[PDB]
Amino acid sequence: MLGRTLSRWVWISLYYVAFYVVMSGIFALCIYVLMRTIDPYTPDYQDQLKSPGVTLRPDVYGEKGLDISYNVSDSTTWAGLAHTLHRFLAGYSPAAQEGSINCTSEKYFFQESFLAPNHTKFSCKFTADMLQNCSGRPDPTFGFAEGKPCFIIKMNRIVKFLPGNSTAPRVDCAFLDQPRDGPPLQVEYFPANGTYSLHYFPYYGKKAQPHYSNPLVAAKLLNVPRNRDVVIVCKILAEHVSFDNPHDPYEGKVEFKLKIQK
Amino acid sequence: EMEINDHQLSVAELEQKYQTSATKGLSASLAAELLLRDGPNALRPPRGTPEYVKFARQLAGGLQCLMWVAAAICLIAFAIQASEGDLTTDDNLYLALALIAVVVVTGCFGYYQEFKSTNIIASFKNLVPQQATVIRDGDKFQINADQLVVGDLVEMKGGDRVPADIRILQAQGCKVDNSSLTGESEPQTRSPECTHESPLETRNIAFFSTMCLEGTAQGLVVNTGDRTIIGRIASLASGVENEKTPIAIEIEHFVDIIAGLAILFGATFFIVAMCIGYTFLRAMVFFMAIVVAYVPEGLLATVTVCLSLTAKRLASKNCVVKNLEAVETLGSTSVICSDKTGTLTQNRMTVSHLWFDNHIHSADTTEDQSGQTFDQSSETWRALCRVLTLCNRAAFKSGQDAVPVPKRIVIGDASETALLKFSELTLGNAMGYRERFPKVCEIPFNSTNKFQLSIHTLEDPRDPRHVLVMKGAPERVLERCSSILIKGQELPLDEQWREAFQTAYLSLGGLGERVLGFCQLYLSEKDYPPGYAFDVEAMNFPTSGLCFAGLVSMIDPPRATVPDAVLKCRTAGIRVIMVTGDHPITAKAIAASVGIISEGSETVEDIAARLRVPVDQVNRKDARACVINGMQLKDMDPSELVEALRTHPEMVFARTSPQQKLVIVESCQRLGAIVAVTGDGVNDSPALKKADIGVAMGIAGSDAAKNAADMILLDDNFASIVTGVEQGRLIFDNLKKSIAYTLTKNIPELTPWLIYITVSVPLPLGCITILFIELCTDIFPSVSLAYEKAESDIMHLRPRNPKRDRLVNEPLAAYSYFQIGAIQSFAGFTDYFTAMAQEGWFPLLCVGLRPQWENHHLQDLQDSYGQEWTFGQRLYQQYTCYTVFFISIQMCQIADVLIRKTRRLSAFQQGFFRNRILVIAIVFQVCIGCFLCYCPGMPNIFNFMPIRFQWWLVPMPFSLLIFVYDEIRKLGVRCCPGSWWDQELYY
Ligand SMILES: CCCCCCCC/C=C\CCCCCCCC(=O)OC[C@H](COP(=O)(O)OCC[N+](C)(C)C)OC(=O)CCCCCCC/C=C/CCCCCCCC
Ligand SMILES: CC(C)CCC[C@@H](C)[C@H]1CC[C@H]2[C@@H]3CC=C4C[C@@H](O)CC[C@]4(C)[C@H]3CC[C@]12C
Ligand SMILES: *[C@@H]1O[C@H](CO)[C@@H](O)[C@H](O)[C@H]1NC(C)=O
Ligand SMILES: *[C@@H]1O[C@H](CO)[C@@H](O)[C@H](O)[C@H]1NC(C)=O
Ligand SMILES: *[C@@H]1O[C@H](CO)[C@@H](O)[C@H](O)[C@H]1NC(C)=O
Ligand SMILES: *[C@@H]1O[C@H](CO)[C@@H](O)[C@H](O)[C@H]1NC(C)=O
Ligand SMILES: *[C@@H]1O[C@H](CO)[C@@H](O)[C@H](O)[C@H]1NC(C)=O
Ligand code: ALF
Ligand SMILES: [K+]
Ligand SMILES: [K+]
Ligand SMILES: [K+]
Ligand SMILES: [Mg+2]
């Protein structure tokens, strides 16, 4: 009998239980109505997705930011990066691209009807061999053994996002601080000129395209000085892709620090 | 030593005791030695705690310590995270700075809450004289009063204050007023005779810092400095424990409740975070966030602002408080110990009753002349008015035409002033009337006559007859009188007339009145020519065979509003005790007049007189009224004092010392009662200091009383006491409502953190947003609840029980937190899930998403649609969630401020828009929220995002539910006043 008697405790506890059950039912009904209102294919709003983000592989991270360091004379500093690239491209192997189809239109793959199996949309096929030399099939070191590393660059997918069809979106990699006497960065691109084909866009969603694969661009860094702390920025050159955001460093571009020991 | 027994000792014994002489005085060397050994004849000021120490004390407490601990945790987290190079955590430093600023501001508000603007020491310092005529080894010289020692010769020049406690050796017509000791300005004769056993009542003792009105005297210094009566009074007034006010006690109670609940929540969820897997750093950050979310950061500031608003409203009614906490204590007061002279009365002798034409008349004694008058249409009345106008020696100060008659400055005795004021009020112009009747002869009330008589000349030049008028003591006039005027006819005095006069005199004197007899005798020009030499020393005046005119009685009457104010206070359940330093008969008469003693109530002596039985055989329980004087009070033990207080609900204390007033106040307080003291005197100052609320008069109050009091009645209305009681009860209720409104919103900002910790959803609410809610958006709506009207007749309710009735209690806390904050939290989470789902994050994906959501090494997190997100985009979505939860809380708080207007009545009954301040506060809150949401730069400065209107509209049904639920609860409470519903769901 603290504060009130035992029976009064029973009544007040029963009242609070009924109150909270009613409130939980109201909350559940509200959530159910919201989920019934939600569109299963297209998000209602994309206020935070005006421009896509850009990542690359391998993605060894320092505390401040993306930082890759390895030694050409030591194979222990290379195995992790090579294994990361291999496990990433395992999902782009042709056995994993069965659900996709071959596309050659070289223009926006607009689909208004669900003609694929599962009542879905068609998605285009991107196999690892489209990355030729940097695909890893002929050279399993991915260029890291000869001091010409390959970096796979992909842009984040956004539903019904069009990057601009005057030309295919392009990847351009360069030094962040251009050396005065130093030569500019020389990069070889896979596919040629490092363009994402227009038939990979628009992305229609996970339900519409369950087998969708982001197109990849491989940047083979040729002219990189050894025992230096260089910084490389790779940005997407598309009409509707913007990389001028101080708050988001990964929007439309990716910056990483590279150090090739010898 | 301090207790005076020197009035009971002979002159030779006193000389032997004090090593002095009655004539020569002390020697200079021995006087210097005694001064060195004793100290100066000055009041030593006891220094109090300094202002910086008080302000530092204001920086401590449950809430202050919790905020200090939270700021320390923020600083430690920032310092540890800065060492690891994670410089993006400046939010911890900013939050620590904000918490420090909140602590400092709350301390400033608390210091303002308890600040006092009175210096009581200076008031006593001004009472001390600076000159003292002293005789040391002959050669009478004048020095400062501080150089006086116990046993010393001093001359009592008229018009100067007495420089020490002095036993009179020789006096020549000396007269003083012991107002600082008794509250009475009546002159007191001082003579070298021990007329009483008590030094406070004897005639051979003069008191430090008392005015010598007239005459010269010589005396021997008995006590100096703090050993004097006034020194002990000053020490008693200054040295009283500063006990907390009831509002301070209630504030501490709910602060302890909140601090305990915060400790509980923080501790258990720190343990839970550690158990389910978290670093100690993260868990202590969680503890800090929980404490910040739960603790009301602006509650104390809002309480202080509400007290300030109530103080401003009270000062608008000529009632000023020395500190903000005084605005409440007059409400919940259960006992009022009131002074009589100057507090309940006007401190001015006034004609009250007249006895002429064999009938007792009652004159209007109101200071505004608004009462009922008496019959003034009799020849006997005109004759008596002529007698009382002509027998006036009082002089009038010129230039007082515009001054009201009761407020005029008159040069004369108290009785003469009262008679002249009565003449001015009734008859046209008293000075003119006296000018038209020149006095050929006049015998002053010097001595040996016991009456005042004068012979005048008729106004009409055609009548050379003279009229002789006499005024004196009633019995002395009676033995001189031989006839009495009845109905304008001269009837010879007989046994019946003498018996009637004696009965009227006894009845009139039994009401504590100063009765004076008036008579006249028309002379003749044959006996004395108009040019006769009426020499005063020639005894030529016969003064025999006079005709009685009537009887006039005077009293210090009550103020006009005092009886109604006392009646209203007693209707409000407050007990009114009268404590005065005046005589018991006058005290009982005034208590009966003002309503402290109700009609029909009788004392033990009254019952004994009615039943013709000795007082010892009368049962004490039969008497509803009781009068105790100072002698019985000092003979009475505390047990008998509390027994008398419990036995007699109508109590009057008369002839009481300041120490006895203090004893009565402390006895009432020890019974667990809130005690109010109303006084206007230095003798009232200790009781004013001790009382929970001390009230002093503005004009009539002395400086010591005004400095001891924490409430001043500027206009001396005494209805301001009723106003203050009403306003204190109102502010108690409005503080309950405001605190409920403030407390209800702490749950919707605490639940997001608990959910975030337990189920690892992305953070729904931020600490900066929580601080904005606490300190910017909801301060004004909570403050605006102090303008709420009373729901019921609060003046017909009894005072609250200080132990039972608390400002914040379990029903209030339970309702406000659980019932309402749960709905607010459900609204916030519904809006949170809505805003998340419209952007691609379904609730099931949100469950457990936090580790990937807050990963900086993860820039392509997929949502429910497969879209990949960067960390910055996810952070902006999190800020959107912050803003959505903030807006939900804002709408639910609009509904809450609507429902907090009444605790029992309906919003429809009390009116939605009658509180214009509340409406403006709601508008301001909405405007501030809109500015925060839609000002450019807010996403980067304060993490506020421009949200869509659907997220404004989602919490509106929840706000409507809050309103409807509170309306239904109040309807059930009204409909069933004694059911389980009223018992449990009423706060
Ligand atoms: C001390 C007392 C505490 C009491 C607390 C309340 C407890 C009960 C409250 C909630 C429990 C869960 C209620 C779930 C209601 C769901 C109703 C429903 O049937 O919806 C269906 C969804 C699944 O939809 P889908 O994926 O197929 O849609 C796909 C979209 N399409 C259809 C377009 C393709 O099911 C779902 O979302 C399930 C997930 C719902 C989100 C739950 C996340 C947990 C968060 C809790 C915060 C609550 C705070 C309460 C604060 C109280 C303060 C005192
Ligand atoms: C309600 C469901 C979800 C959980 C049930 C938990 C029970 C044991 C808890 C949750 C809510 C709690 C109540 C909440 C509020 C009050 C009012 C307070 O003055 C006394 C305790 C009391 C009465 C609590 C008792 C214990 C309680 C009933
Ligand atoms: C790279 O590895 C070789 C050994 O294989 C070592 O000698 C050299 O110091 C390494 N590079 C640097 C500069 O650290
Ligand atoms: C969906 O389509 C794929 C196409 O390969 C097929 O393998 C799978 O069985 C289908 N599943 C359903 C449930 O229709
Ligand atoms: C990549 O491989 C192809 C085929 O072997 C070769 O022709 C090309 O020169 C290689 N590129 C580089 C720079 O290694
Ligand atoms: C690009 O798409 C638009 C429709 O959005 C179409 O009108 C236009 O012809 C296209 N341009 C090219 C170069 O394909
Ligand atoms: C892109 O690559 C093709 C070869 O497939 C080449 O002919 C064309 O010039 C390249 N475009 C640019 C901009 O270099
Ligand atoms: F004025 Al008083 F006791 F009557 F101080
Ligand atoms: K809070
Ligand atoms: K006081
Ligand atoms: K006190
Ligand atoms: Mg007084």
Numbering used by the authors:
A (entry chain B): 29 to 290
B (entry chain A): 47 to 1033
Sentences from the paper on this structure:
The gastric proton pump (H+,K+-ATPase) transports a proton into the stomach lumen for every K+ ion exchanged in the opposite direction. H+,K+-ATPase contains two subunits—the α-subunit, which transports the ions across the membrane, and the β-subunit, which helps in membrane targeting and regulation of protein conformational equilibrium. The α-subunit contains ten transmembrane helices that constitute the ion-binding site and three cytoplasmic domains. In the lumen-facing state of the pump (E2), the pump selectively binds K+ despite the presence of a 10-fold higher concentration of Na+.
The E936Q mutant exhibits both Na+ activation and reduced apparent affinity for K+. Since the E936 residue is located more than 11 Å away from the K+-binding site, it is unlikely that this residue is directly involved in the cation coordination. This suggests allosteric effect of E936Q mutation at the cation-binding site. Mutation of E936Q is introduced on the background of the previously reported Y799W mutant, which induces luminal gate closure. A grid was prepared in the presence of phosphate analogue AlF4 and K+, and a 2.5 Å cryo-EM map stabilized in the K+-occluded E2-Pi state was obtained. Consistent with the local resolution plot, the bound K+, coordinating amino acid residues in the cation-binding site, and the E936Q mutation itself are well resolved, indicating that the model is highly plausible. Indeed, when the two structures were aligned according to their TM helices, the RMSD value of the respective region was 0.38 Å, indicating that the structure of the cation-binding site in the transmembrane region is very similar to each other in the two mutants. In the Y799W crystal structure, E936 located at the TM8 makes a hydrogen bond with D824 in TM6 (2.8 Å), while the E936Q side chain is slightly further away from D824 (4.0 Å) to form a strong hydrogen bond in the Y799W/E936Q mutant structure. Nevertheless, the valence calculated from the distance between K+ and the oxygen atoms participating in K+ coordination is 0.85 for the Y799W/E936Q mutant, which is lower than the value of 1.05 obtained for the WT, suggesting that K+ coordination in the E936Q mutant is not as compact as in the case of WT (see distance between K+ and indicated oxygen atoms). A speculative explanation is that the change in the hydrogen bond between E936 and D824 alters the position of TM5 where D824 in present, which subsequently affects the rotamer conformation or position of the E820 side chain, which is also located in TM5 and involved in the K+ coordination.
